[PDB]
Amino acid sequence: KVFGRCELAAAMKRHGLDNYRGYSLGNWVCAAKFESNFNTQATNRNTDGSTDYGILQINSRWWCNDGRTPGSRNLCNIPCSALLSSDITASVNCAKKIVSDGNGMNAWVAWRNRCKGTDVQAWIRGCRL
Ligand SMILES: [Cl-]
Ligand SMILES: [Cl-]
Ligand code: NA
Ligand code: NA
């Protein structure tokens, strides 16, 4: 599924991400835009052999099992394919674990390079929330 900007904001808000660990909703929408272009089915292979999955491009070396990343840890206890569903529940619950591990949203390279320090509130402007 490819989400609309406001559609995704509403879904993320209902799942408890607005101001989760101090990150306003606009940060999560900005990160999803540049990680996946709002597409739940997005996948990308990394140089080390791991793969990033879903709307928030969660990596298989640490967070999910895809059966082909040797030595990986599967800390969200989920198959990586569950992160590609049109239902974002699994991706949100795993993202909550990631953002609480110490480094905040700096774990998402696209957030650091393209959202951090910008007017992220613009990503929810005009939406009925
Ligand atoms: Cl915001
Ligand atoms: Cl980047
Ligand atoms: Na929309
Ligand atoms: Na893994």
DSSP letter string over the chain?
-BPPHHHHHHHHHHTT-TTBTTB-HHHHHHHHHHHHTTBTT-EEE-TTS-EEETTTTEETTTT-B-S-STT---SS-SBGGGGGSSSTHHHHHHHHHHHTSSSGGGGSHHHHHHTTTS-GGGGTTT---
Strand, coil or helix: 58: strand
CA 102 – CA 88 distance, rounded (Å): 23
What residues have their beta carbon closer than 5 A to ion ligand 3? Answer: 4, 6-7
Ligand in closest contact with the CA of 25: 1
Contact in structure between 45 and 60 (CB atoms under 8 Å):
no
Please tell me whether 119 is known to bind a ligand: no
Helix (H) / strand (E) containing 99? helix 89-99
CATH class assigned to 1-129: mainly alpha
Resolution at which this structure was determined, Å: 1.7
Indicate the domain borders of the chain: 1-129
Ligand 1 centre distance from Cα of residue 110 (Å): 17
